[PDB]
């Protein structure tokens, strides 16, 4: 026998989360162990299996990693215990102490914390410094640069995820919040897209940018013809000189370049990098090999803040990532909340970042020299995580998102004024559920 605390996570991060689980087991003195359980790789199927297990009162479900936008759903439904339900009374303070504000904001609902952040994410600008002298600082500069490049016969696509789905919703949300707007009110009860002249201007601004990118000379046909594509691959293959995307494109760039799949960046030819591809095809460099690959990448691969909407205001970039929640189905609340605290301590935060490629939520880690070595863009991330935009927090997020995506796509057919009103009407229909 033996008491087991289940720990449900996306399969994508199964190896990483298993290792920190095993690290935590060391320090429980055999009182109990954490067992990682892999949900499907698809986020939507992860949420649907958790729901099945919660409404089915599966008593072995203890700790679960939730997407940052599932907070309201799981809290309103009584599926995620409030942190104040910890018999030890430690969960609340732990989740606040040394956690960046952006991640923390995703974990609340009705002014109460219902989960503890563990990982986060934000989008940056990635550009070709050999083709682009300075990184565009706002979206008008993005447009003008891409158009100049087209007239010069050079890579002109702006690589951004804009197909119908959550990625387009994320992009619209960033533009909207950066312009001072909001989809919903504080309680997710009212639609605030067009309720005041100022809010309508923010919505119109964001729609104009979406539409401007779609109709820029030399645009990506995945946008102009609403086709399947990939922002990451477009940049790696040399068809886009500008990209907004999560930081996983950094590791992908170096690994694929070392494998010889990046034509403008032949890291595969550098003698010092011989043997750095391990027996499963992963770029696993030493500290010096890393600094060589990153130094050589700088000639052709740069990063910068997400472009602003307004000339002077830094962008409010939609945040992603995972929060740790204790399920209402647990039989051992005390051990479950203790497990959450161990899984998100400083050493395990260092691990998920360095070995897992998942940005940590602990502010202290953005001062760690080892973290700064492997995240040279740490300072931009820290700033965008502290001043983040949050997707609308509502129990009906899934219906709201689907409805917004259907209106916004195809983005070539946006008419900012009339689309603004159609956005608000469709958001209203989701809130009426």
Curated annotation (Swiss-Prot):
GO terms for cellular component: ATP-binding cassette (ABC) transporter complex; periplasmic space; plasma membrane. It holds the Pfam family SBP_bac_1. The keyword Kinase does not apply. GO terms for biological process: biological process involved in interaction with host; trehalose transport. Being a receptor for trehalose, which is essential for the survival and virulence of M.tuberculosis, this protein is a potential target for antitubercular drug design. Its main location: membrane. Keywords: Cell inner membrane, Cell membrane, Disulfide bond, Lipoprotein, Membrane, Palmitate, Signal, Sugar transport, Transport. Part of the ABC transporter complex LpqY-SugA-SugB-SugC, which is highly specific for uptake of trehalose. Involved in the recycling of extracellular trehalose released from trehalose-containing molecules synthesized by M.tuberculosis. Trehalose uptake is essential for virulence. No binding affinity for maltose. Monomer. The complex is composed of two ATP-binding proteins (SugC), two transmembrane proteins (SugA and SugB) and a solute-binding protein (LpqY). This is Trehalose-binding lipoprotein LpqY. The gene is lpqY.
């Amino acid at each position: 026998q033996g008491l087991v605390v289940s720990f449900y996570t996306p399969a994508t991060d199964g190896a990483t989360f298993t290792a920190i689980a095993q690290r935590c087991n060391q320090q429980f003195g055999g009182r109990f162990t954490i067992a990682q359980v892999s949900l499907p790789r698809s986020p939507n199927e992860q949420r649907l299996q958790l729901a099945r297990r919660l409404t089915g009162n599966d008593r072995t479900l203890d700790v679960m990693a939730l997407d940052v936008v599932w907070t309201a759903e799981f809290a309103e439904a009584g599926w995620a215990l409030p942190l104040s339900d910890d018999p030890a009374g430690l969960a609340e303070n732990d989740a606040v102490a040394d956690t960046l504000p952006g991640p923390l904001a995703t974990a609340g609902w009705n002014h109460k914390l219902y989960a503890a952040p563990v990982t986060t994410n934000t989008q940056l600008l990635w550009y070709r410094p050999d083709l682009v002298n300075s990184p565009p600082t706002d979206w008008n500069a993005m447009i003008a640069e891409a158009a100049r490049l087209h007239a010069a016969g050079e890579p002109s696509w702006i690589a951004v995820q804009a197909n119908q789905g959550e990625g387009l919703v994320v992009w619209f949300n960033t533009l909207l919040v950066s312009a001072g707007g909001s989809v919903l009110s504080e309680d997710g009860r009212h639609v605030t897209l067009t309720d005041t002249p100022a809010h309508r201007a923010a919505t119109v601004s964001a729609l104009q940018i979406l539409k401007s990118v779609a109709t820029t000379p030399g645009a990506d046909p995945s946008i102009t013809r609403t086709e399947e594509g990939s922002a990451r691959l477009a940049f790696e293959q040399g068809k886009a000189a500008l990209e907004v995307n999560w930081p996983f494109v950094f590791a992908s760039m170096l690994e694929n370049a070392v494998k010889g799949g990046v034509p403008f960046l032949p890291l595969n030819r550098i003698p010092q990098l011989a043997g750095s591809i391990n027996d499963i095809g992963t770029f696993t460099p030493s500290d010096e090999q890393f600094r060589i690959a990153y130094d050589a990448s700088q000639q052709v691969f740069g990063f910068a803040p997400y472009p602003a909407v307004a000339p002077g205001q830094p962008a409010k970039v939609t945040i992603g990532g995972l929060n740790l929640a204790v399920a209402k189905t647990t039989r051992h609340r005390a051990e479950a909340f203790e497990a959450v605290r161990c899984l998100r301590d400083q050493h395990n935060q260092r691990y998920v970042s360095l070995e897992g490629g998942l940005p940590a939520v602990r502010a202290s880690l953005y001062s760690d020299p080892q973290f700064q070595a492997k995240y040279p863009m740490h300072a931009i991330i820290r700033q965008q995580l502290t001043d983040a935009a949050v997707r609308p927090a509502t129990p009906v997020y899934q219906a709201l998102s689907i409805r917004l995506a259907a209106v916004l796509s195809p983005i070539t057919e946006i008419d900012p004024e009339s689309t603004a009103d159609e956005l608000a009407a469709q958001a209203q229909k989701a809130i009426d559920g």
